[PDB]
Ligand binder design. Structure first.
Ligand SMILES: *[C@@H]1O[C@H](CO)[C@@H](O)[C@H](O)[C@H]1NC(C)=O
Ligand SMILES: C[C@@H]1O[C@@H](O)[C@H](O)[C@H](O)[C@H]1O
Length: 106
Protein backbone atom coordinates (compact mmCIF):
# COMPACT_ATOMS: atom_id res chain seq x y z
CA UNK A 1 0.00 0.00 0.00
CA UNK A 2 2.13 2.85 -1.33
CA UNK A 3 -0.55 5.34 -0.12
CA UNK A 4 -2.14 5.68 3.32
CA UNK A 5 -4.08 2.48 2.62
CA UNK A 6 -7.23 4.24 3.83
CA UNK A 7 -9.58 6.93 2.51
CA UNK A 8 -8.31 8.64 -0.63
CA UNK A 9 -8.03 12.40 -1.07
CA UNK A 10 -7.14 14.85 -3.82
CA UNK A 11 -6.69 18.62 -3.90
CA UNK A 12 -6.43 20.94 -6.92
CA UNK A 13 -5.91 24.65 -7.57
CA UNK A 14 -8.97 26.52 -8.81
CA UNK A 15 -9.30 26.57 -12.60
CA UNK A 16 -7.52 23.24 -13.29
CA UNK A 17 -8.88 19.70 -13.85
CA UNK A 18 -8.78 17.21 -10.98
CA UNK A 19 -8.70 13.45 -11.48
CA UNK A 20 -9.84 10.70 -9.14
CA UNK A 21 -9.18 6.99 -9.64
CA UNK A 22 -10.20 4.01 -7.53
CA UNK A 23 -8.05 0.84 -7.42
CA UNK A 24 -9.13 -2.44 -9.03
CA UNK A 25 -12.84 -2.58 -9.83
CA UNK A 26 -13.83 -0.39 -6.90
CA UNK A 27 -15.85 2.81 -7.32
CA UNK A 28 -15.32 6.30 -5.95
CA UNK A 29 -17.63 7.39 -3.13
CA UNK A 30 -17.44 11.07 -2.25
CA UNK A 31 -17.68 11.61 1.51
CA UNK A 32 -16.72 15.25 1.91
CA UNK A 33 -15.53 18.01 -0.36
CA UNK A 34 -15.36 21.80 -0.63
CA UNK A 35 -14.53 24.60 -3.07
CA UNK A 36 -12.97 27.79 -1.70
CA UNK A 37 -10.00 28.67 0.50
CA UNK A 38 -9.35 27.68 4.12
CA UNK A 39 -5.56 27.74 4.02
CA UNK A 40 -2.83 30.08 2.77
CA UNK A 41 -0.18 27.41 2.20
CA UNK A 42 -2.06 25.55 -0.53
CA UNK A 43 -1.90 26.40 -4.23
CA UNK A 44 0.80 29.06 -3.88
CA UNK A 45 -0.63 32.11 -5.61
CA UNK A 46 -0.41 35.88 -5.16
CA UNK A 47 -0.45 37.00 -1.50
CA UNK A 48 -3.58 39.06 -2.10
CA UNK A 49 -5.46 35.98 -3.27
CA UNK A 50 -3.89 33.99 -0.45
CA UNK A 51 -4.80 36.43 2.34
CA UNK A 52 -8.34 35.18 3.03
CA UNK A 53 -8.27 31.69 4.52
CA UNK A 54 -12.01 31.61 5.14
CA UNK A 55 -14.14 30.61 2.15
CA UNK A 56 -16.50 27.63 2.09
CA UNK A 57 -18.94 26.24 -0.46
CA UNK A 58 -21.00 23.25 0.82
CA UNK A 59 -22.67 22.70 -2.54
CA UNK A 60 -19.23 21.90 -3.93
CA UNK A 61 -19.71 18.49 -2.31
CA UNK A 62 -22.89 17.75 -4.25
CA UNK A 63 -21.13 18.58 -7.51
CA UNK A 64 -18.24 16.19 -6.94
CA UNK A 65 -20.51 13.60 -5.40
CA UNK A 66 -22.72 13.48 -8.49
CA UNK A 67 -19.68 13.54 -10.79
CA UNK A 68 -17.59 10.88 -9.01
CA UNK A 69 -20.16 8.81 -7.10
CA UNK A 70 -20.34 5.22 -8.30
CA UNK A 71 -17.53 5.86 -10.78
CA UNK A 72 -14.08 4.32 -10.89
CA UNK A 73 -12.65 7.65 -12.04
CA UNK A 74 -13.78 11.22 -12.67
CA UNK A 75 -12.25 14.41 -14.08
CA UNK A 76 -13.60 17.85 -13.18
CA UNK A 77 -12.48 21.46 -13.56
CA UNK A 78 -11.76 22.84 -10.11
CA UNK A 79 -13.44 26.08 -11.19
CA UNK A 80 -15.02 27.69 -14.24
CA UNK A 81 -18.75 27.13 -14.71
CA UNK A 82 -18.24 23.84 -12.87
CA UNK A 83 -18.09 25.65 -9.53
CA UNK A 84 -20.16 28.67 -8.33
CA UNK A 85 -18.50 31.81 -6.97
CA UNK A 86 -18.36 32.11 -3.15
CA UNK A 87 -15.32 34.38 -2.74
CA UNK A 88 -14.43 36.15 -6.02
CA UNK A 89 -10.89 37.56 -6.03
CA UNK A 90 -9.29 34.79 -3.92
CA UNK A 91 -7.29 31.81 -5.27
CA UNK A 92 -9.46 28.91 -4.17
CA UNK A 93 -9.12 25.17 -4.40
CA UNK A 94 -11.09 21.98 -4.31
CA UNK A 95 -10.57 19.34 -1.66
CA UNK A 96 -12.27 15.97 -1.90
CA UNK A 97 -12.14 13.02 0.46
CA UNK A 98 -13.54 9.71 -0.77
CA UNK A 99 -13.27 5.94 -0.49
CA UNK A 100 -13.29 3.06 -2.97
CA UNK A 101 -15.84 0.26 -2.56
CA UNK A 102 -16.77 -2.82 -4.69
CA UNK A 103 -19.38 -2.36 -7.41
CA UNK A 104 -21.18 -5.27 -5.75
CA UNK A 105 -21.54 -7.11 -2.44
CA UNK A 106 -18.30 -8.22 -0.80
C1 LIG B 1 -24.66 4.03 -6.44
O1 LIG B 1 -25.07 2.68 -6.57
C2 LIG B 1 -25.84 2.20 -5.46
C3 LIG B 1 -26.20 0.75 -5.75
O2 LIG B 1 -27.13 0.23 -4.78
C4 LIG B 1 -27.08 3.06 -5.25
O3 LIG B 1 -27.77 2.63 -4.07
C5 LIG B 1 -26.67 4.50 -5.11
O4 LIG B 1 -27.84 5.33 -4.98
C6 LIG B 1 -25.87 4.92 -6.31
N1 LIG B 1 -25.47 6.33 -6.17
C7 LIG B 1 -25.41 7.10 -7.25
C8 LIG B 1 -24.99 8.54 -7.04
O5 LIG B 1 -25.67 6.70 -8.38
C1 LIG C 1 -8.49 34.62 -7.61
C2 LIG C 1 -9.56 34.21 -8.63
O1 LIG C 1 -10.21 35.40 -9.16
C3 LIG C 1 -11.23 35.07 -10.16
O2 LIG C 1 -10.61 34.37 -11.24
C4 LIG C 1 -12.33 34.19 -9.53
O3 LIG C 1 -12.96 34.89 -8.46
C5 LIG C 1 -11.67 32.91 -8.99
O4 LIG C 1 -12.66 32.07 -8.38
C6 LIG C 1 -10.60 33.29 -7.95
O5 LIG C 1 -9.96 32.12 -7.44
Amino acid sequence: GLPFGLMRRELACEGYPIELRCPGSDVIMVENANYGRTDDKICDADPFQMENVQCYLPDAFKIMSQRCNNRTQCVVVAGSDAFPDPCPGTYKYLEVQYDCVPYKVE
